[PDB]
Structure 1
Amino acid sequence: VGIRFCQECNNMLYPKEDKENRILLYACRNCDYQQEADNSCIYVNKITHEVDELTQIIADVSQDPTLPRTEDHPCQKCGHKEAVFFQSHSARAEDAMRLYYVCTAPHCGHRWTE
């Protein structure tokens, strides 16, 4: 799923398979340098793409004044009552309806979902 660059020309390492050692190794084409891949995975594709939005939410949204704030749900690792919440901004998840909470503390930046 990831992308790796070789050390010679810093170019794409397309997946290549050898018939002698029977090991998948990421090999560059223009340069003869080739490196083995330990993941043994070429790529993945989530058709439903139900990726958690917590990683996508940025912690710097706490200072936003337009975002609504609710004190009902406090931060897990802070205890601060104030917590900014909002709905998913991703168009893919627009079909679903959910709330994502972020701690209002200046430096915490914790994101959690109920």
Structure 2
Amino acid sequence: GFVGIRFCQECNNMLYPKEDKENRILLYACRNCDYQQEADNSCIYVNKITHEVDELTQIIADVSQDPTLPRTEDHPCQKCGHKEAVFFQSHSARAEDAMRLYYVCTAPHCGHRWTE
């Protein structure tokens, strides 16, 4: 998971995490404001050392209209069932050790992407 930025309600500033001494709870106070709002996550800061990223979250569907990008007819979609798909490698910095391919369905109003 993560933690987000939760913004103040008075000043629209960034809320810090703060432990309530003498109810024993986790709060969110402001700097600029005197705004105390009550936490729910019980989680403050997270850090993925493995930096485990799923690439299918970064892939946009717009790739399919790329003239310069190879086209197959051997992998069909799963939502719609189209036959055409484009494919490319991670195309990312920080690629750990992978030459894994990624597919996008080449049919408008679908933009389904998958990895095999």
If the TM-score is normalised by the length of the shorter chain, which range does it land in?
over 0.9
Aligned length: 114
Q: Which is richer in strand?
A: 1
Q: Which stretches of structure 1, 4 residues or longer, exceed 2 Å deviation after superposition?
A: none
Task: Name the Cα RMSD after superposition.
Answer: 1.1
The C-alpha deviation readout for 1:38-65, integer Å capped at 9, x for no partner, is 1111121111112100010011111111
Structure 2 portions without partners, runs of 5+: none
Any gaps of 5 or more consecutive residues in structure 1? none
Task: Please report the TM-score for the alignment, with normalisation by the length of structure 1.
Answer: 0.94
Q: Is the 1:88–1:94 contact (alpha carbons within 8 Å) kept by the matching residues of 2?
A: no
Instruction: Tell me the distance in 1 between the aligned counterparts of 2:41 and 2:96.
Output: 33
State how far apart, in whole Å, the 2-side matches of 1:65 and 1:111 are.
Answer: 18
Report the Cα distance in structure 2 between the residues aligned to 1:17 and 1:88, rounded to whole angstroms: 42
- Quick check: 1:2–1:43 contact (8 Å CA) kept in 2? no
Work out the CA distance in 1 between the residues paired with 2:113 and 2:106: 10
Q: For residue 91 of structure 1, report the CA deviation from its aligned partner.
A: 1.1
Identity of matched residues, %: 100
